[PDB]
Design an enzyme around this catalytic site. Structure first.
Site, PDB file in Angstrom:
ATOM      1  N   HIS A 129       0.666  -3.532   6.502  1.00  0.00           N
ATOM      2  CA  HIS A 129      -0.661  -3.457   7.157  1.00  0.00           C
ATOM      3  C   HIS A 129      -1.804  -4.048   6.358  1.00  0.00           C
ATOM      4  CE1 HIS A 129      -0.527   0.073   4.622  1.00  0.00           C
ATOM      5  NE2 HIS A 129      -1.896   0.097   4.658  1.00  0.00           N
ATOM      6  N   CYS A 163       0.873  -1.204   0.000  1.00  0.00           N
ATOM      7  CA  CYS A 163       0.000   0.000   0.000  1.00  0.00           C
ATOM      8  C   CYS A 163       0.903   1.246   0.000  1.00  0.00           C
ATOM      9  CB  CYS A 163      -0.977  -0.017   1.181  1.00  0.00           C
ATOM     10  SG  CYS A 163      -1.924   1.500   1.432  1.00  0.00           S
ATOM     11  N   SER A 206       0.627   3.735   1.736  1.00  0.00           N
ATOM     12  CA  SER A 206       0.881   4.164   3.128  1.00  0.00           C
ATOM     13  C   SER A 206       2.164   3.512   3.660  1.00  0.00           C
ATOM     14  CB  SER A 206      -0.254   3.863   4.040  1.00  0.00           C
ATOM     15  OG  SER A 206      -1.409   4.541   3.626  1.00  0.00           O
ATOM     16  N   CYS A 261      -6.952  -3.377   3.480  1.00  0.00           N
ATOM     17  CA  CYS A 261      -6.766  -1.919   3.388  1.00  0.00           C
ATOM     18  C   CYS A 261      -7.341  -1.355   2.113  1.00  0.00           C
ATOM     19  CB  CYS A 261      -5.313  -1.481   3.525  1.00  0.00           C
ATOM     20  SG  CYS A 261      -5.266   0.305   3.461  1.00  0.00           S
ATOM     21  N   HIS A 284       4.875   5.597   2.445  1.00  0.00           N
ATOM     22  CA  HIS A 284       4.938   6.866   3.219  1.00  0.00           C
ATOM     23  C   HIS A 284       5.904   6.729   4.426  1.00  0.00           C
ATOM     24  CE1 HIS A 284       2.062   8.633   0.699  1.00  0.00           C
ATOM     25  NE2 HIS A 284       0.939   8.406   1.398  1.00  0.00           N
TER      26      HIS A 284
HETATM   27  N1  NAJ Z   1      -7.700   6.707   4.449  1.00  0.00           N
HETATM   28  C1  NAJ Z   1      -7.256   5.439   4.462  1.00  0.00           C
HETATM   29  O1  NAJ Z   1      -7.696   4.629   5.303  1.00  0.00           O
HETATM   30  C2  NAJ Z   1      -6.253   5.103   3.445  1.00  0.00           C
HETATM   31  C3  NAJ Z   1      -6.090   3.763   3.080  1.00  0.00           C
HETATM   32  C4  NAJ Z   1      -5.267   3.320   2.066  1.00  0.00           C
HETATM   33  C5  NAJ Z   1      -4.544   4.327   1.462  1.00  0.00           C
HETATM   34  N2  NAJ Z   1      -4.543   5.658   1.885  1.00  0.00           N
HETATM   35  C6  NAJ Z   1      -3.834   6.676   1.221  1.00  0.00           C
HETATM   36  O2  NAJ Z   1      -4.468   6.847  -0.091  1.00  0.00           O
HETATM   37  C7  NAJ Z   1      -3.519   7.351  -1.042  1.00  0.00           C
HETATM   38  C8  NAJ Z   1      -3.564   6.461  -2.265  1.00  0.00           C
HETATM   39  O3  NAJ Z   1      -2.997   5.184  -1.964  1.00  0.00           O
HETATM   40  P1  NAJ Z   1      -2.727   4.167  -3.175  1.00  0.00           P
HETATM   41  O4  NAJ Z   1      -3.934   4.087  -4.086  1.00  0.00           O
HETATM   42  O5  NAJ Z   1      -2.181   2.904  -2.533  1.00  0.00           O
HETATM   43  O6  NAJ Z   1      -1.549   4.972  -3.918  1.00  0.00           O
HETATM   44  P2  NAJ Z   1      -0.996   4.993  -5.364  1.00  0.00           P
HETATM   45  O7  NAJ Z   1      -1.135   3.645  -5.971  1.00  0.00           O
HETATM   46  O8  NAJ Z   1       0.318   5.673  -5.284  1.00  0.00           O
HETATM   47  O9  NAJ Z   1      -2.028   5.928  -6.171  1.00  0.00           O
HETATM   48  C9  NAJ Z   1      -1.939   7.373  -6.118  1.00  0.00           C
HETATM   49  C10 NAJ Z   1      -2.202   7.899  -7.516  1.00  0.00           C
HETATM   50  O10 NAJ Z   1      -2.201   9.318  -7.480  1.00  0.00           O
HETATM   51  C11 NAJ Z   1      -1.706   9.779  -8.705  1.00  0.00           C
HETATM   52  N3  NAJ Z   1      -1.220  11.168  -8.551  1.00  0.00           N
HETATM   53  C12 NAJ Z   1      -0.100  11.559  -7.945  1.00  0.00           C
HETATM   54  N4  NAJ Z   1      -0.005  12.871  -7.933  1.00  0.00           N
HETATM   55  C13 NAJ Z   1      -1.150  13.343  -8.591  1.00  0.00           C
HETATM   56  C14 NAJ Z   1      -1.748  14.642  -8.935  1.00  0.00           C
HETATM   57  N5  NAJ Z   1      -1.062  15.742  -8.617  1.00  0.00           N
HETATM   58  N6  NAJ Z   1      -2.864  14.624  -9.487  1.00  0.00           N
HETATM   59  C15 NAJ Z   1      -3.609  13.525  -9.802  1.00  0.00           C
HETATM   60  N7  NAJ Z   1      -3.126  12.281  -9.546  1.00  0.00           N
HETATM   61  C16 NAJ Z   1      -1.924  12.258  -8.906  1.00  0.00           C
HETATM   62  C17 NAJ Z   1      -0.574   8.774  -9.070  1.00  0.00           C
HETATM   63  O11 NAJ Z   1      -0.201   8.901 -10.450  1.00  0.00           O
HETATM   64  C18 NAJ Z   1      -1.214   7.429  -8.624  1.00  0.00           C
HETATM   65  O12 NAJ Z   1      -1.827   6.741  -9.687  1.00  0.00           O
HETATM   66  C19 NAJ Z   1      -2.174   7.390  -0.281  1.00  0.00           C
HETATM   67  O13 NAJ Z   1      -1.901   8.695   0.261  1.00  0.00           O
HETATM   68  C20 NAJ Z   1      -2.381   6.415   0.876  1.00  0.00           C
HETATM   69  O14 NAJ Z   1      -1.478   6.641   1.977  1.00  0.00           O
HETATM   70  C21 NAJ Z   1      -5.408   5.989   2.885  1.00  0.00           C
HETATM   71  O1  PFB Z   2      -3.237   2.887   4.221  1.00  0.00           O
HETATM   72  C1  PFB Z   2      -3.786   3.021   5.566  1.00  0.00           C
HETATM   73  C2  PFB Z   2      -3.154   4.062   6.428  1.00  0.00           C
HETATM   74  C3  PFB Z   2      -3.746   5.278   6.760  1.00  0.00           C
HETATM   75  F1  PFB Z   2      -4.926   5.606   6.164  1.00  0.00           F
HETATM   76  C4  PFB Z   2      -3.136   6.183   7.523  1.00  0.00           C
HETATM   77  F2  PFB Z   2      -3.751   7.352   7.815  1.00  0.00           F
HETATM   78  C5  PFB Z   2      -1.961   5.843   8.101  1.00  0.00           C
HETATM   79  F3  PFB Z   2      -1.374   6.715   8.914  1.00  0.00           F
HETATM   80  C6  PFB Z   2      -1.356   4.653   7.858  1.00  0.00           C
HETATM   81  F4  PFB Z   2      -0.181   4.334   8.455  1.00  0.00           F
HETATM   82  C7  PFB Z   2      -1.979   3.768   7.051  1.00  0.00           C
HETATM   83  F5  PFB Z   2      -1.394   2.577   6.767  1.00  0.00           F
HETATM   84 ZN    ZN Z   3      -3.118   1.124   3.406  1.00  0.00          ZN
END
Ligand code: NAJ
Ligand code: PFB
Ligand code: ZN
Ligand code: NAJ
Ligand code: PFB
Ligand code: ZN
Ligand code: ZN
Ligand code: ZN
Lengths: 374, 374
Positions: free
Chosen positions: B67, B46, B48, B174, B51
């Site tokens: 995770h 993921c 995250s 996730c 990150h």
């Molecule tokens: N809230 C939650 O519980 C939760 C859970 C899982 C992931 N996340 C977060 O969700 C985000 C996405 O995760 P993911 O899908 O695994 O990531 P990912 O696979 O990196 O997807 C992100 C996408 O954003 C695109 N991108 C980057 N910059 C830009 C921009 N400026 N404009 C438009 N598109 C852009 C990029 O090309 C990619 O396809 C991350 O920040 C994670 O940390 C949060």
């Molecule tokens: O992808 C899920 C995810 C979150 F949405 C967070 F906000 C975070 F801090 C983290 F560690 C995490 F794994």
């Molecule tokens: Zn996640």
């Protein structure tokens, strides 16, 4: 006998920011198609009117302000179908055209014909019905209620009960409906919940009224003026706090008091800092915060989006989320049936000619609502 | 037998930020009371997790990250009642204690026992079950799935269907559940609506899946990597736009495309600028915007609160709003019953030993989800 003729009458003209209103003669044109000319009976002084004076709210000047009012139809333009001469009416500062995507949406009320987002200070047709000293004078929010007579578009007026007491129900035109709807409609306050209300003016007291109506178990009023606390308790506050009494920031105090954050918070002041504080003090997973206060023109707040990622909901609304023309007559009917009280908001009464004294009372902190009589 | 004994196994240890994972032997203590030791079967990569490597997310190091996983219970501590040795399980990065005010709230999921807000990188009892070269190693979100074996608190594990394909259902831990729930539960997307999804990774694609399941008529994918568009259309996007193709800001483009703003928007990237763009492109009176992307540590966004005062709703959520222990078994059951697909999210399957290569695929743009198999 005045139908189709220019009316000369007194109005309160704002020529310049940060100056008293000038009570002087204006010329009020007759209504054009789908326009309504109204003899005003009563208007409240809302803090938003004061924002026009202070420059907190930018609208073109010179202007006839006022938006919280009630009056009697003097004449209707061609094609008007929803009011008649002699009807009691409330001007609607948020129109209801009934035709746009917002008016058609079950939860929309910020009709696309509004003059709030990017104020022109005109009628819908882009022109003014007011002249003063031979100069055109702006309208305000399509209402312009600080005048013995105004002209409004049909979509900005609602017919109300003929037996209405206009010197009370004018508050349904802004401050009561805003605060009460912000609680019951926008936030959807739940029975047994804990609420925090920032700002205990006419609108925040109306928020308290709505939270009490909705069955909240705890309603914490927040103001830096402790003179506002007694009335807040009368209308339903369970406790009041003054941020100035505490060493710690009030979001921390309210989080402690609510054993981990409140269910519902309301910003009812118009400060960027209290908008962020009010969001922060609602519980991080399921709390809801509603912005009601009008922010200063063109200024951005700063916040950490982690406040939202954990689960908080942040929203704002105009006019308590009420579709204005549908809702104002119902709210008047409900008032008539004693479903809510307006008298707790009315602290002072003045003639229209003492408008500047009414503003002085609001600015000093003494008043909640002053009602001006024409 | 391993029960009651220290296990020496392989894990991916992150010793410092911005370095590759180190694949080496760790010692995994037996589970204490109310703890569960799990043999891992599959884990997703993921963003995250990335990150933590990049310093976008701060958590104590050194650490066993990961995770998004599934495995099989090896042993249970005293007093565990919800899983038994041999059960298929998903570790829950958001726990469900069942006892806190959030767990008891009908709309809360961000349990107060979580290790996200203020990460300690431990078990519930504030200690670690991991050592490596004689040094204690931190947990991550109570899960630590980048290891052949982990130990989790019982409130951070759910039992799932014994016939579950763990190499697919690990995504319910996730990225699928987050995106899908963000649409169906947190936004509550409506039939016939128009949605905009910013970010077309594994999570954004799952948001699309949810928006389509909810009956949206239009689903506009937004990404700066046009290679992401084909899969976004396969799972339901009706249009895709790349901001880089336009002279105007993309909020203006999306406002124009949707004849005045979208019904629902989603930020699924993790950028302050796109969180504000996403809010702005939803209809000003009744739009809803959901933040899903994790923001960089300690940075504030700037926005104009008039965006909310007109009527917009802004919210965020962890794990799609799902109460984790209740929801994960149901999600797996629904997958077994063919109610949604996971294969569109899986682009690569690698042995665990190729974890670094899996992160390189994510960072380069090539992959959606890489599944690591133990
Ligand atoms: N809230 C939650 O519980 C939760 C859970 C899982 C992931 N996340 C977060 O969700 C985000 C996405 O995760 P993911 O899908 O695994 O990531 P990912 O696979 O990196 O997807 C992100 C996408 O954003 C695109 N991108 C980057 N910059 C830009 C921009 N400026 N404009 C438009 N598109 C852009 C990029 O090309 C990619 O396809 C991350 O920040 C994670 O940390 C949060
Ligand atoms: O992808 C899920 C995810 C979150 F949405 C967070 F906000 C975070 F801090 C983290 F560690 C995490 F794994
Ligand atoms: Zn996640
Ligand atoms: N959203 C709408 O439709 C709508 C309608 C009506 C009014 N408004 C706005 O709502 C706000 C309140 O209006 P009102 O009730 O007429 O005004 P008001 O009577 O000035 O009440 C504001 C209260 O805020 C208190 N206050 C000032 N600063 C602070 C502080 N730092 N912390 C705590 N309390 C503080 C102040 O003492 C006063 O009692 C104004 O910004 C109006 O412009 C919005
Ligand atoms: O008090 C109501 C009110 C508002 F809520 C505004 F946002 C606004 F711009 C304004 F002029 C106004 F009068
Ligand atoms: Zn309309
Ligand atoms: Zn007002
Ligand atoms: Zn809990």
């Amino acid at each position: 006998s005045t139908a189709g003729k220019v009316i000369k009458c007194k109005a309160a003209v704002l020529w310049e920011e940060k100056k008293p209103f000038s009570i002087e003669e204006v010329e009020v044109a007759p209504p054009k198609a789908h326009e309504v000319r109204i003899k005003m009976v009563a208007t409240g002084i809302c803090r938003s009117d004061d924002h026009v004076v202070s420059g907190t709210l930018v609208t073109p000047l010179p202007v006839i302000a006022g938006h919280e009012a009630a009056g009697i139809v003097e004449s209707i333009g061609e094609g008007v179908t929803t009011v008649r001469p002699g009807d009691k009416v409330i001007p609607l500062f948020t129109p209801q055209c009934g035709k746009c995507r917002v008016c058609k949406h079950p939860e929309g009320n910020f009709c696309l014909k509004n003059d709030l987002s990017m104020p022109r200070g005109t009628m819908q047709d882009g022109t003014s019905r007011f002249t003063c000293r031979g100069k055109p004078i702006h309208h305000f929010l399509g209402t312009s209620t600080f005048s013995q007579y105004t002209v409004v578009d049909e979509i900005s007026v609602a017919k109300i009960d003929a037996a209405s007491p206009l010197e009370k129900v004018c508050l349904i035109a802004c401050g009561f409906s805003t605060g009460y709807g912000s609680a019951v409609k926008v936030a959807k306050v739940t029975q047994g919940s804990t609420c925090a209300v920032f700002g205990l003016g006419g609108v925040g007291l109306s928020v308290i009224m709505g939270c009490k109506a909705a069955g909240a178990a705890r309603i914490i009023g927040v103001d830096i003026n402790k003179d506002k606390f007694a009335k807040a308790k009368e209308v339903g506050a369970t406790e009041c706090v003054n941020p100035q009494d505490y060493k710690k920031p009030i979001q921390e105090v309210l989080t402690e008091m609510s054993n981990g954050g409140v269910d519902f918070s309301f910003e009812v002041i118009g400060r960027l800092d209290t908008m962020v504080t009010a969001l922060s003090c609602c519980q991080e997973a399921y709390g809801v915060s509603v912005i009601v206060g009008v922010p200063p023109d063109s200024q951005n707040l700063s916040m950490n989006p982690m406040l939202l990622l954990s689960g908080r909901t942040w929203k704002g609304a105009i006019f308590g989320g009420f579709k204005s023309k549908d809702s104002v007559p119902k709210l008047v009917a409900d008032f008539m049936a004693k479903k809510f009280a307006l008298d707790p908001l009315i602290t002072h009464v003045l003639p229209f000619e003492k408008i500047n004294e009414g503003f002085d009372l609001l600015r000093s902190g003494e008043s909640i609502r002053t009602i001006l009589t024409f």
